[PDB]
Amino acid sequence: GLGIKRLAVVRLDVDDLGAAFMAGFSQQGNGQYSTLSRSATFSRSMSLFFKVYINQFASDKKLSIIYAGGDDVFAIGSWQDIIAFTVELRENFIKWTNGKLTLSAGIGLFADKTPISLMAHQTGELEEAAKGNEKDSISLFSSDYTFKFDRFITNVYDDKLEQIRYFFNHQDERGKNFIYKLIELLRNHDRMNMARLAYYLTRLEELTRETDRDKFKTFKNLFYSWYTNKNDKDRKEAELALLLYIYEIRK
Amino acid sequence: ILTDENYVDIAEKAILKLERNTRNRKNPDAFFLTTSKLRNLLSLTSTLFDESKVKEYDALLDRIAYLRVQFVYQAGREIAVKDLIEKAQILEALKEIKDRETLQRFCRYMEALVAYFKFYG
Amino acid sequence: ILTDENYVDIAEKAILKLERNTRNRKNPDAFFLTTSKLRNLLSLTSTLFDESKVKEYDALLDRIAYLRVQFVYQAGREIAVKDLIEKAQILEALKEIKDRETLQRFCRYMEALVAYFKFYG
Amino acid sequence: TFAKIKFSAQIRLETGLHIGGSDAFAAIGAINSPVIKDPITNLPIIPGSSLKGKMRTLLAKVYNEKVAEKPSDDSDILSRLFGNSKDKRFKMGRLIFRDAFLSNADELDSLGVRSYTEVKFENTIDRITAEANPRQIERAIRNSTFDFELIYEITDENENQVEEDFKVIRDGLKLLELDYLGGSGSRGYGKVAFENLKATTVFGNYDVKTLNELLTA
Amino acid sequence: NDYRTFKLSLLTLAPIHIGNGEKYTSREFIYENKKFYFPDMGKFYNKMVEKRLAEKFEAFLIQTRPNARNNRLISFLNDNRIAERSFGGYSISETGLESDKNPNSAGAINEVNKFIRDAFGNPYIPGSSLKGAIRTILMNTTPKWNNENAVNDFGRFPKENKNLIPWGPKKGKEYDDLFNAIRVSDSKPFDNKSLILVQKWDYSAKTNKAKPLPLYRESISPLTKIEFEITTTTDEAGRLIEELGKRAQAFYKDYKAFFLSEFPDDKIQANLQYPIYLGAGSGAWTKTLFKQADGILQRRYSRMKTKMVKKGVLKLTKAPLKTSLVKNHESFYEMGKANFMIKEI
RNA sequence: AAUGGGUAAUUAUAGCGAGCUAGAAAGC
RNA sequence: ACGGAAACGCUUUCUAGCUCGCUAUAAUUACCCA
């Protein structure tokens, strides 16, 4: 019963497949590789990935690839499997495409029995906001959560989410109210809220029991690191990590 | 002085600049000033800061100078709070209360003072 | 006279204005006023300060009218309290008791006097 | 059906109770620890929250078989009277403890009382060097009364447990005169009595006459 | 039920003053009968302004006048015939031995510290008084609490450790808080006319003299009984209140050999019950740790009023006689030597 | 040697400053 | 003779449930000043 009754919709887009098709290899060399055979082989490779291989990445995961191919993937499904499917799709696409042609996905949460052309429009809006971020970005649950994928899976979905999950699994004082207040302090965030968070973590530091106390001490040392990191590249990441954890433990 | 954006760092290195338990190194780098000699001051600023959002500025100006009474008084009892008001320019910022907004800003500065005072040990 | 924004400063520049011990030159410029002889002044006012909140001023004016004579009497017993009441015009402020808010303002002014005396020496 | 009954008592003080007041703009040489107060009339009143939290530990000293370590671990004879925070059907508590107001303003003006509080100097003599450290903790006067209201529930889920919890509630009423209602405790500050018990059903059909046997006896 | 109550009853062998801070000053009372009178001075002034001579009342209060029989407001109330005595207040009787070698001065006293009174006007003794008296006895008569109630290397002979006794939440432990299990309740308000205003009387060491002091605190009339409810809930403080019957005589015995010896036992009282020292004037040794504050208590007094050499000067009083409890002539009592007996009810 | 007078000190100290539960569901 | 006419982002829902302003604390100390 842990997890929220959602359905997430990802619409990928290959970042400038028109420019990667028309110019593409012609950047390299003196026009030595500006041939037709390489372009046909590359487009058949895109066909073989986006038109066959998505049924391999979606095999165990529970979703529905509605449309795929060319430079678009519209895949509806359940949100843990959708996020893990985007994770595996890019983390084997950059193994497939050597890190070149970064894909710009957009994943929106939608409630139960909400219509789909209402939903495809918002997914496309998050998709184009992820497009215009830079060359590539993920847009997660709203256009203000816009990270690079190289920042999203490594920092949030590999480092931060596992620390956050293990920290709240192996303790039972700090339940969900503490996570909600951490999300709110991550979201408002003026200069004074860093002082309020430095008060909050330190006031909870001497309130946990003595046995599992230094877990909280290293976690507040590791949390005030990214909260006051003065970059805003390590802050909305942590807010999204806590949102993913809360949505994973929803009763 | 205190503006809308600069006061938190002011309170930060007005907590840092305060001198600590140098003699008797039993958990050293700990303040001579006690936290109950700071919360008894901030319980004035909190009952201003939340009764400022209900009222005018020009209805509050009786308690506003009483803040300058009590800060002078509690600075006069212990040498630690006199040291505090020398490091943290409290009485020099109580002249800078001209409206509801700068009063709430000064109360946020007092909250930053107590927050960073609790932060270091 | 004193109002809501000046009564600290009324008790500020009066305290630097009182004389000190020109003779007895060990820790010099110490006050002729001693702390007990100012707590004897404040302890009259501070009971009426809290009686004012429960009661009403028109059911209270007799005790402030007698408190006039009390400040005269404590002024009549020393060379410092006879000096204090006019170098800091407490007897001038005692003629204007017009409502309970001005009464509490005068009591906070006395508290400011005690605070700024405790701030020095 | 659904009934709702009322337990009215008079908290008559003996050497009354300091429940920490609100305003920090206190004093220099006056009250620096006031009593809680009804701010429209500045009367010292007894809130129901101190009553509930005192009766929680006072009845957990009796009816707990297990050690507590926390709230939301009471022995379920109290957890339907004071509520759990965790038990699935016992989030509510069916006991409403209304704030007791100081009633006898009329008779205590016949007694020569200036104002309905007092200032009790209670210094801290230093055990070496004999120096003093005064406090003026304000308490309600010695013989005031308070209208301790109380409201109990009756549903179609209380067959016989209406009378099961009454001698648990009356255990609180005659153990509140064993403890001190909040305050400082070991300097008096809480010895009280509960005059004029008049228990009736303010809502719903329930009997008042066979109900009136175990309350005062 | 683990609440083990007691009952302490306190006879008053001595003058016993406690508390309340405030006072009636020099020009603030009436002595025209043999009874002292304290009206409400605000009520007195507001009724006297109808007599319209209040401007002379401004000059009467600052009047530096010798032959102080005309100083203490009897002259204001007989020289200008205002002798109504309707001012709200409480009358008390006189001592009789109030002043020494001052004929017709039964009224030229100056400062009367009030006894503690509630809002009713009836004086009582609060349980904080008896608990502060109990804590010095139960501190000195237990050897584990007498070693390091000292400097803590924090200042200049500052204070007690305040940590030899368990105190507070102590987050991570059980509920310790040993003195919470001694719930010293406040006494019942007794009669108003059991007050005497005894003078402080210093009896000097190395100088056989009985130099008195101009501070006449309103104490309790001798040989009056006082009730005290005392409950216990923890076994250690319960055993301390059980062992009070040994610890009181033990503290008084070791305090006699430390202090009360070399001083003549004619003025020193007899016990006749369980002895104890209550507040306001019984000497700092009855309010502190006697074998711990040898040079630590007296170090502060480097002023115009220094304790002679080491240890405090003996303090006595003057109050009339009943039953004897004085054991000499001229009525030198001991200012705080009370008696108690205890029984679990 | 009398008599006139109180004088000086501390004015609250040390803490706790919020803890978990729910964080939108169910239909149109 | 307007991709236009007709079209309420709407119906239901207690910011709630649990929580002592509490813990230690004699208004006291000292003996004087012309």
Q: Does residue E154 belong to the interface with chain B, where contact is any CB pair within 8 Å? A: yes
User: Which residues of C, range 21-80, sit inside 8 Å of D by Cβ?
Assistant: 39, 42-43, 46-47, 49-51, 53-55
Q: How does strand A138-140 pair with strand A106-110?
A: parallel
Are E336 and E279 in contact, with CB atoms under 8 Å apart?
yes
Length of chain E: 345
| Selection from E123, E119, E90, E279 nearest residue E190 by Cα | E123
CA distance A157 to C102: 64
| Selection from E81, E94, E120 nearest residue E35 by Cα | E94
Helix axes B79-87, B36-49, angle to 10 degrees: 50
Q: Which two tokens stand for residue E169?
A: 């939440």
C1' of nucleotide F18: residue with nearest CA: A203
Q: Which H or E run contains A7?
A: strand A7-12
Domain ranges of chain C: 1-121
Examine chains A and B and say if they touch (3+ CB pairs below 8 A): yes
| Selection from B112, B119, B120, B118 nearest residue B49 by Cα | B112
CA E201 to the chain's CA centroid: 13
With a CB cutoff of 8 Å and minimum separation 6, the contacts of E31 are E37, E72, E74, E94, E106, E107
Range of the domain at D126: 1-217
How crowded is residue E22: how many other Cβ atoms within 10 Å of its Cβ?
12
Helices (H) and strands (E) in chain D, counts: 4, 11
Q: Report the residue from E120, E181, E300 with minimal CB separation from D112.
A: E120
Nearest nt to C36, CA vs C1'?
A: F8
Beta bridge partners of D192: D13
Are B65 and C5 in contact, with CB atoms under 8 Å apart?
yes
Q: Which H or E run contains A12?
A: strand A7-12
Collapsing DSSP states into helix, strand and coil, what is residue A140? Answer: strand
Whether the beta carbon of E159 falls within 7 A of nucleic chain G: the reply is no
Beta bridge partners of D120: D137
Buried b (16+ CB within 10 A) or exposed e, A192-213: bbbbbbbbbbbeebeebeeeee
Buried b (16+ CB within 10 A) or exposed e, B106-115: bbbbbbbbbb
Q: CB-hemisphere CA count at 13 Å for B59?
A: 7
With a CB cutoff of 8 Å and minimum separation 6, the contacts of B59 are none
Length of chain C: 121
Which residues of chain C lie closer than 8 angstroms to E58, CB-CB?
69, 72
Are C14 and C87 in contact, with CB atoms under 8 Å apart?
yes
State whether D25 and B40 contact (CB < 8 Å). no
Phi-psi region of E107 (alpha: psi -120 to 50; beta: other; left: phi over 0): left
Q: Report the residue from C65, C75, C76 with minimal CB separation from E46.
A: C65
CA distance E242 to E342: 9
Q: Does residue B22 belong to the interface with chain E, where contact is any CB pair within 8 Å? A: no
Beta bridge partners of E39: E89
With a CB cutoff of 8 Å and minimum separation 6, the contacts of A53 are none
Q: Does residue E153 belong to the interface with chain B, where contact is any CB pair within 8 Å? A: yes
Q: Which H or E run contains A144?
A: none
In the chain, the amino acid numbered E36 is: F
| Selection from E257, E242, E271, E264 nearest residue E314 by Cα | E264
| Selection from E307, E78, E87 nearest residue E204 by Cα | E307
Helix axes B100-119, B36-49, angle to 10 degrees: 150
The secondary structure of D127-157 as a DSSP string is TTTT-----EEEEE-TT-EEEE--EEEE-TT
Which residues of chain C lie closer than 8 angstroms to B70, CB-CB?
115
Which residues of chain A lie closer than 8 angstroms to B116, CB-CB?
195, 198
Phi-psi region of C110 (alpha: psi -120 to 50; beta: other; left: phi over 0): alpha
Are D144 and D104 in contact, with CB atoms under 8 Å apart?
yes
Q: Which two tokens stand for residue B70?
A: 């009590």
Nucleotides of F under 7 A from a protein CB: 2-28
Which residues of chain B lie closer than 8 angstroms to D24, CB-CB?
40, 43-44, 46-47
**CA–C1' gap, A50 and G2, in angstroms:** 44
Examine chains E and D and say if they touch (3+ CB pairs below 8 A): yes
Chain D residues 153-212 within 7 Å (CB) of strand G: 180-187
With a CB cutoff of 8 Å and minimum separation 6, the contacts of E230 are E5, E6, E7, E8, E182, E183, E184, E185, E241, E342
| Selection from E107, E99, E46 nearest residue E72 by Cα | E107
HEC string of chain E?
Answer: CCCEEEEEEEECCCCCCCCCCCEECCCCCEECCCEEEEECHHHHHHHHCCCCCHHHHHHHHCCCCCCHHHCCCCCCCCCCCCCCCCCCEEEEECCCCCCCCCCCCCCCCCCEECCCECCCCCECCCHHHHHHHHHHHHHHCCHHHCCCCCCCCCCCCCCCCCCCCCCCCCCCCCCCCHHHHCEECCCCCCCCCCECCEEEEEECCCCCCCCEEEEEECCECCCCEEEEEEEECCHHHHHHHHCHHHHHHHHHHHHHHHHHCCCCCCCCCCCCCEEEECCCCCCHHHCCCCCCCCCCCCCCCCCCCCCCCCCCCEEECCCCCCCCCCCCCCCCCCCCEEEEEECCC
CA distance D101 to E43: 31
**CA–C1' gap, A21 and F22, in angstroms:** 52
Burial class of residue E166 in the structure, from the number of CB atoms within 10 Å of its CB (0-12 exposed, 13-18 middle, 19+ buried): middle
Are E139 and D127 in contact, with CB atoms under 8 Å apart?
yes
HEC string of B61-120?
Answer: HHHHHHHHHHHHHHHHHCHHHHHHHHHCCHHHHCCCCCCHHHHHHHHHHHHHHHHHHHHC
**CA–C1' gap, B58 and G16, in angstroms:** 37
In Å, the largest CA–CA distance within chain C is 50
**Which 8-state DSSP code applies to residue A8?**
E
Are D81 and D96 in contact, with CB atoms under 8 Å apart?
no
Are E203 and E209 in contact, with CB atoms under 8 Å apart?
yes
Length of chain D: 217
As a whole number of Å, the CA-based R_g of chain E is: 23
Collapsing DSSP states into helix, strand and coil, what is residue A50? Answer: helix
Burial class of residue A175 in the structure, from the number of CB atoms within 10 Å of its CB (0-12 exposed, 13-18 middle, 19+ buried): exposed
User: What are the φ/ψ torsions at residue B81 (nearest 5 degrees)?
Assistant: -75, -30
Q: Which H or E run contains B2?
A: none
State whether E45 and C76 contact (CB < 8 Å). no
How crowded is residue E303: how many other Cβ atoms within 10 Å of its Cβ?
6
Taken in order C45, C47, C52, C53, the sign of the CA dihedral is: positive
Q: Does residue E22 belong to the interface with chain B, where contact is any CB pair within 8 Å? A: no
| Selection from C102, C101, C87 nearest residue C15 by Cα | C87
How crowded is residue D55: how many other Cβ atoms within 10 Å of its Cβ?
24
Are C119 and B79 in contact, with CB atoms under 8 Å apart?
no
**CA–C1' gap, D99 and F11, in angstroms:** 33
CA distance A56 to A33: 32
Q: How was this structure determined?
A: cryo-EM
| Selection from A87, A82, A243 nearest residue A153 by Cα | A87
User: Which residues of A, range 193-232, sit inside 8 Å of E by Cβ?
Assistant: 206, 209-210
**Which 8-state DSSP code applies to residue D101?**
P
How crowded is residue D117: how many other Cβ atoms within 10 Å of its Cβ?
26
Sheet containing A138-140, strands listed edge to edge, beginning at the edge strand earlier in sequence = A63-69, A72-77, A7-12, A106-110, A138-140, A146-147
**Which 8-state DSSP code applies to residue C57?**
G
Q: Domains in chain D: how many in total?
A: 1
Q: Where are the alpha helices (DSSP H) in chain D?
A: 48-63, 107-110, 161-164, 166-173
How crowded is residue B44: how many other Cβ atoms within 10 Å of its Cβ?
23
User: What are the φ/ψ torsions at residue E36 (nearest 5 degrees)?
Assistant: -75, 145
Q: How far is CA D206 from CA B36, D6, D94, in A?
A: 53, 12, 16
As a whole number of Å, the CA-based R_g of chain A is: 21
Q: Report the residue from C46, C47, C51 with minimal CB separation from D28.
A: C46
Length of chain A: 251
| Selection from C16, C12, C30, C23 nearest residue C113 by Cα | C12
| Selection from C27, C3, C32 nearest residue C15 by Cα | C32
- Mind telling me how many Å the CA of E103 is from chain D's nearest CA? 37
Collapsing DSSP states into helix, strand and coil, what is residue A129? Answer: helix
Least CA distance to B71: which residue of chain D? D25
Are E284 and E312 in contact, with CB atoms under 8 Å apart?
yes
Q: Which H or E run contains D43?
A: strand D43-44
Are E226 and E12 in contact, with CB atoms under 8 Å apart?
yes
PDB resolution in Å: 3.8
Q: Does residue D24 belong to the interface with chain B, where contact is any CB pair within 8 Å? A: yes
Collapsing DSSP states into helix, strand and coil, what is residue A250? Answer: coil
